[PDB]
Amino acid sequence: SFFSFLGEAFDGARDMWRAYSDMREANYIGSDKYFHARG
Amino acid sequence: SFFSFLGEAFDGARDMWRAYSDMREANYIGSDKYFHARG
Amino acid sequence: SFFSFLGEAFDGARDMWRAYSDMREANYIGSDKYFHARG
Amino acid sequence: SFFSFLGEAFDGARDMWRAYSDMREANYIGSDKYFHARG
Amino acid sequence: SFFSFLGEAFDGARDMWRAYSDMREANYIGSDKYFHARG
Amino acid sequence: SFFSFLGEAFDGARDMWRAYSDMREANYIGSDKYFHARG
Amino acid sequence: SFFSFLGEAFDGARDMWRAYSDMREANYIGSDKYFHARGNYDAAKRGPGGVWAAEAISDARENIQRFF
Amino acid sequence: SFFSFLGEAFDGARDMWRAYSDMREANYIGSDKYFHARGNYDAAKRGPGGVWAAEAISDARENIQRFF
Amino acid sequence: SFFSFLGEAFDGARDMWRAYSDMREANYIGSDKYFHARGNYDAAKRGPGGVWAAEAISDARENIQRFF
Amino acid sequence: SFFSFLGEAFDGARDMWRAYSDMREANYIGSDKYFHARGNYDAAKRGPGGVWAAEAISDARENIQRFF
Amino acid sequence: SFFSFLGEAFDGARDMWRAYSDMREANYIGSDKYFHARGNYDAAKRGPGGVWAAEAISDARENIQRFF
Amino acid sequence: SFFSFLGEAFDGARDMWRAYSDMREANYIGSDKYFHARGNYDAAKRGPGGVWAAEAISDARENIQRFF
């Protein structure tokens, strides 16, 4: 549960939760990045 | 459950939740990025 | 459940939830990006 | 549960939670990065 | 539970929790980085 | 439970918790980094 | 790029590749099955699935071969 | 890039690759099964799955071969 | 890059690779099964799975071979 | 890069690789099974799994071979 | 890079590798099973798993071989 | 790099490697099973696991071989 939130029976407040993640080029199962110069 | 929210029996407030994720080029199952210069 | 929201028996407030995701070039199952210069 | 939050029967406050993670090039199951210059 | 939070029956305060992690090139199960120059 | 937090029946305070971890190139199960120059 | 192949000079090749596959219910970017569903009885007899490959190479004076 | 292959000069190759596979319910970027679901009975007889490969190479004076 | 292969000069190769596989319910970037689910009965008879490879190479004066 | 292979000059090779595998419920970057789930009964008969390889090489004057 | 292999000059090789494997429920970067779950009964009959390899090489005047 | 292998000049090799394995529930970077879970009954019949290798090499005037 990446960057998840959970609560029960709770009162809130201003800016109670803030997340500032960066996921450029992320969460890659089998995607390769390669080159093959035989020349 | 990436960047998910969950709650029960809870009172809210201004800006109770904020998320600022960046997912450029993300969540790739088999999509490769390659070049093949035989020349 | 990416960037999902869920709640029950809850009172709201101004700006209770805000999401600012960026998904340019995202969620790619088999779409490759490649070039093949034999010359 | 990476960067997850959990609570019960709790009162909130301003900026109660803040996360500033960076996940560029992260969470890679089998995605290689290589080159093969026979020439 | 990397960088997780948990509590029960607790009152909050300003900036009660802050995390400043960096995960560039992190969480890699089998993704190699190599080159093979036979030439 | 790397960099985890846990508490019960506790009152908070300003900046009650701060973490400043760096995980560049971290958490690698089988991902090698090598080269093989037969030439 | 699943089951990718590359080559040069296939001079005289034979039977180079046999990609038998069952991609049923596959490649779903966004989807929700039985989302907010209550009381649904799911008895679909999806039955056999996947490859059921058989290959018999037999030389004889008399021969009897049966498949499936 | 699953089951990737590369090569040069396949001069005279035979039976180079046999990629039998069952990719059912695979490759899901975002999905939620039985999300917020209550009372759902799930009895699908998904049945056999995966590869069931058989290969019989037999020379004889008399022969009897049966598959599945 | 699962089950990757590389080569040069496959001059006269035979039976180079046999990649039998069962990738069912695999490769999930984001997913949630039975998320927030209450009372769900899950009896799916997923049944046999994975490879069930058989290979019989037999020479004879009389022969009887049976598979599955 | 699971089960990786590399080579040069496969001049006359035979039966170089047999990658039988069961990758069911594998490769999950982000996922949550039975997340926030209450009362769920899970009786799926997932059944046999993994490789069930058999290889019989037998020469004879009379032969009887049975598989699975 | 699990079960990695490297080589040069496979001139005349035979049966070089047999990578039988069961990667079920494997390779999980982020996941949470039965997270915040209460009362869940888990009776899945996952059943046999892993490799069940058999290899019989037998020469005879009369032969009887049975597998699984 | 588990079970790594390296070599040069495999001129005439045979049966070089047999990597049978059971990688179930393996390779977990971040995960939490039964996290914050209360009252969960866990009776999964995971059953047999790991390799169950058998290898019978027998020459005879009459032969009877049985596996599993």
Author numbering:
A (entry chain G), B (entry chain I), C (entry chain K), D (entry chain E), E (entry chain C), F (entry chain A): 2 to 40
G (entry chain L), H (entry chain J), I (entry chain H), J (entry chain F), K (entry chain D), L (entry chain B): 2 to 69
Q: How did the manuscript describe this experimental structure?
A:
Systemic AA amyloidosis is a debilitating protein misfolding disease in humans and animals. Serum amyloid A1 (SAA1) is the precursor protein of AA amyloid fibrils. It is an acute phase protein that becomes strongly upregulated during inflammation. Two variants of systemic AA amyloidosis have been described in humans.
In this research, we determined the cryo-EM structures of amyloid fibrils that were isolated from the kidneys of two patients with the vascular variant of systemic AA amyloidosis. Reconstruction of three-dimensional (3D) maps of this fibril morphology achieved, based on the 0.143 Fourier shell correlation (FSC) criterion, a spatial resolution of 2.56 Å for the fibrils from the patient I and of 2.68 Å for the fibrils from patient II. The two 3D maps were highly similar, C1-symmetrical and consisted of two non-equal protein stacks (stacks A and B). Stack A is formed by residues Ser2 to Gly40, while stack B contains residues Ser2 to Phe69, reminiscent of the two groups of fibrils protein obtained by mass spectrometry. The fibril proteins in both stacks show folds that are dominated by β-sheet structure and lack the α-helical conformation of natively folded SAA1. There are four cross-β sheets (β1-β4) in stack A and eight (β1-β8) in stack B. The β-sheets show a notable left-hand twist, which is defined here in the direction of the fibril axis. In the vascular fibril, the Cα atom of Ser2 is 3 Å lower than the Cα atom of Tyr29 in chain A and 5 Å lower in chain B. In the glomerular fibril, the Cα atom of Ser2 is 6 Å higher along the z-axis than the Cα atom of Tyr29. These very different z-axial positions of the N-terminal ends of the fibril proteins lead to the different tilt of the sheet β1 relative to the fibril z-axis, which explains the different directions of the fibril twist of the glomerular and the vascular fibril. While the glomerular fibril shows a symmetrical distribution of the positive and negative charges in the fibril cross-section, the vascular fibril presents a clearly asymmetrical charge distribution. The current vascular structure allows similar conclusions as the fibril protein N-terminus is also buried in the fibril core, indicating that the first has to be removed in order to allow the formation of the fibril structure in the vascular disease variant.
